[PDB]
């Protein structure tokens, strides 16, 4: 089946888990198609076996670091010749944020990964990272259309590039996606012709169709207010109101929402590292550069989230491993759990994605995303409940690198880490 793994780090695992070497190092690998936000080529290319025939790399212009002559050697020179580069030029303040790997093997087998790390050394090793691994797929004719496959193809088409159409999309077409018939592929694209992001994910949740209602986000970037005049958070003021039916598409005052949350027993959660969690990380502030929440200029927005919604959660310090401590994770997850401690072990749905909690990644009801983003959605009604566990205790549908349970910020002491 599909499986979530925790990425091994050179620092945290000194002498299940995955590495880039287990993904790219296998002698039966014929071809990889890579999508990422940054590529350190001498680090990535060292991961591959000498048997590989083609490496196709889709990335944003300026984010593909060439190897300097002084770093070249005999091995890399050979592998470098097998790289085909597809460079996307993006508008300002937009990102090719998707991370995706499509491998093709000798037998005609295909495997897909969503890693949470970009292909650089520091990113692979410092913050915690995960990797979603698809089941094994086979080149073969297919019968029934598989939603995951179909949304993957829309996503590729939305780049509108000849090289993607010919070099990637046609090879993906040949793959039978039946082993993935339960899952959905959810994405953002800046393409104006293809809907995507929040609006599309909302419609898809509506279509897939008393209790306490838990909506948890784990994200390495928290965007600023949706409006300049008022304090409006994407999770608490737009996403959660939409998913619960508090608002329909044709934004409420804060006080109305707080009351609606009491009354409907909606419990919002954002997992984001405190200031103090770096103290108890084994590389201390080494992983902190990846955690973006810039709230000092608009302090009331933060206060609102921290004190009125009480939205912030942190790791359970008593459950983390010694070797990883409270090192925060650069994965992104969005999940919903209905109850009526054990919260989040059985889910209504869970999205694992490259998308951060920002308007540029998601869009809004009326704005389109600016980024490319991709992820995989597990929905109860598509399977009977989605099962989830924490890697800190290490067979469930999902595994997450934060503790379960997560613990509310202590309002007397904890502050979101502010870079």
Swiss-Prot record:
It comes from the Eukaryota. One of its GO terms (biological process) is DNA repair. Residues 221-225 are annotated as: Interaction with DNA. The record marks 358 as: Interaction with DNA. Signal peptide: none annotated. The active site is at residues 97, 330. It is an enzyme of class 3 (hydrolase). GO terms for molecular function: 3'-tyrosyl-DNA phosphodiesterase activity; 5'-tyrosyl-DNA phosphodiesterase activity; double-stranded DNA binding; exonuclease activity; single-stranded DNA binding. Its EC number is 3.1.4.-. It is found in: Nucleus. GO terms for cellular component: mitochondrion; nucleus. Substrate binds at residues 99, 332. Keywords: DNA damage, DNA repair, Exonuclease, Hydrolase, Nuclease, Nucleus, Repeat. Present with 2130 molecules/cell in log phase SD medium. Belongs to the tyrosyl-DNA phosphodiesterase family. DNA repair enzyme that can remove a variety of covalent adducts from DNA through hydrolysis of a 3'-phosphodiester bond, giving rise to DNA with a free 3' phosphate. Catalyzes the hydrolysis of dead-end complexes between DNA and the topoisomerase I active site tyrosine residue. Hydrolyzes 3'-phosphoglycolates on protruding 3' ends on DNA double-strand breaks due to DNA damage by radiation and free radicals. Also cleaves 5' phosphotyrosyl adducts resulting from dead-end complexes between DNA and the active site tyrosine of topoisomerase II. Contributes to DNA repair after radiation damage. This is Tyrosyl-DNA phosphodiesterase 1. It comes from Saccharomyces cerevisiae (strain ATCC 204508 / S288c) (Baker's yeast). The chain holds residues 79 to 538 of 544 of the full protein.
């Amino acid at each position: 089946g599909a499986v979530f793994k925790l990425m091994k780090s050179d620092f945290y695992e000194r002498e299940d888990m995955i590495t880039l070497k287990d993904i790219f190092g296998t002698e039966t690998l014929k071809r990889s198609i890579l999508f990422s936000f940054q590529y350190e080529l001498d680090f990535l290319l060292r991961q591959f076996h000498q048997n590989v025939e083609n490496i196709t790399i889709v990335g944003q212009k300026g984010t593909i670091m060439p190897i300097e002559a002084r770093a070249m050697d005999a091995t890399l020179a050979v592998i470098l010749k097998k790289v085909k580069l597809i460079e996307i030029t993006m508008p300002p303040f937009a990102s090719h944020h998707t991370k995706l790997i499509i491998n093709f093997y000798d037998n005609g087998e295909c495997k897909i990964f969503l890693p949470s790390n970009n292909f650089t050394s520091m990113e692979t090793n410092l913050p915690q990272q995960v990797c979603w691994c698809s089941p094994l797929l086979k080149i073969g004719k297919e019968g029934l259309p598989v939603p995951f496959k179909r949304s993957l193809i829309e996503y590729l088409n939305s780049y509108h590039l000849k090289d993607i159409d010919e070099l990637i999309t046609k090879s993906v077409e040949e793959v039978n996606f039946a082993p993935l018939s339960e899952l959905e592929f959810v994405y953002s694209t800046p393409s104006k012709f293809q809907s995507s992001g929040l609006l599309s994910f909302y419609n898809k949740l509506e279509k897939l169709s008393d209790t306490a209602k838990h909506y948890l986000c784990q994200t390495s970037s928290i965007g600023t207010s949706l409006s300049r005049a008022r304090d409006e958070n994407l999770w608490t003021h737009l996403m959660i109101p939409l998913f619960t039916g508090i608002m329909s598409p044709p934004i409420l005052p804060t006080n109305s929402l707080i009351n609606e949350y009491s009354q409907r027993k909606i419990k919002p959660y954002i997992i984001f590292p405190t200031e103090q969690e770096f103290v108890t990380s084994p590389l201390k502030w080494s992983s902190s550069g990846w955690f973006h929440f810039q709230y000092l200029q608009k302090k009331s927005y933060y206060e609102m989230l921290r004190n009125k919604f009480k939205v912030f959660y942190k790791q359970d310090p008593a459950m983390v491993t010694r070797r990883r401590g409270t090192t925060p994770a650069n994965s992104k997850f969005y999940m919903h759990c209905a109850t009526n401690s054990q919260v989040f072990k059985e889910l209504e749905w869970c999205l694992y994605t490259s998308a951060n909690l920002s308007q540029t990644a998601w869009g809004t009801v009326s704005r389109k995303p600016r980024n490319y983003e991709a992820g995989v959605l597990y929905h109860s009604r598509r399977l009977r409940k989605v099962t989830c566990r924490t890697f800190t205790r290490d067979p469930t549908h999902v595994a997450v690198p934060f503790t379960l349970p997560v613990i509310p910020y202590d309002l007397a002491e904890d502050e979101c880490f502010c870079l």
